[PDB]
Amino acid sequence: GSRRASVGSHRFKVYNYMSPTFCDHCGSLLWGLVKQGLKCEDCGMNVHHKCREKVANLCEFIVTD
Amino acid sequence: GSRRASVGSHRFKVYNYMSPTFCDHCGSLLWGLVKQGLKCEDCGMNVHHKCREKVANLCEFIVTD
Ligand SMILES: [Zn+2]
Ligand SMILES: [Zn+2]
Ligand SMILES: [Zn+2]
Ligand SMILES: [Zn+2]
């Protein structure tokens, strides 16, 4: 048997974090109070702009519907 | 002297074409009457779903602003 996963590549979009949030790639704070980084519209990964260049494209999440 | 170019990776989104449109990668018609393919939100490239993985990610266009 298997889980069902949605599989593709990340779809990052600038996001306004309402509380202090860290980069899921490098571990440093997403600096500032607005537009601090990007959140993947599909899986929720949060990254610095500069870290968008560093993460693997692979984007998967379990469809728990 | 240098053109100003916007340089990134493609941002493909499923698109509902209103008139017969060809794949910018392979040259075959984007078949169907809805969701026939994907259009890059940045540069306008049109591709079949199956051709998305065949094209280079590089996405550039001249900024004529
Ligand atoms: Zn993702
Ligand atoms: Zn980072
Ligand atoms: Zn493009
Ligand atoms: Zn094609």
UniProtKB/Swiss-Prot annotation, chains A, B:
Zinc fingers classed as Phorbol-ester/DAG-type: ranges: 10-59
Organism domain of life: Eukaryota
Protein name per its UniProtKB record: Protein kinase C delta type regulatory subunit
Organism: Mus musculus
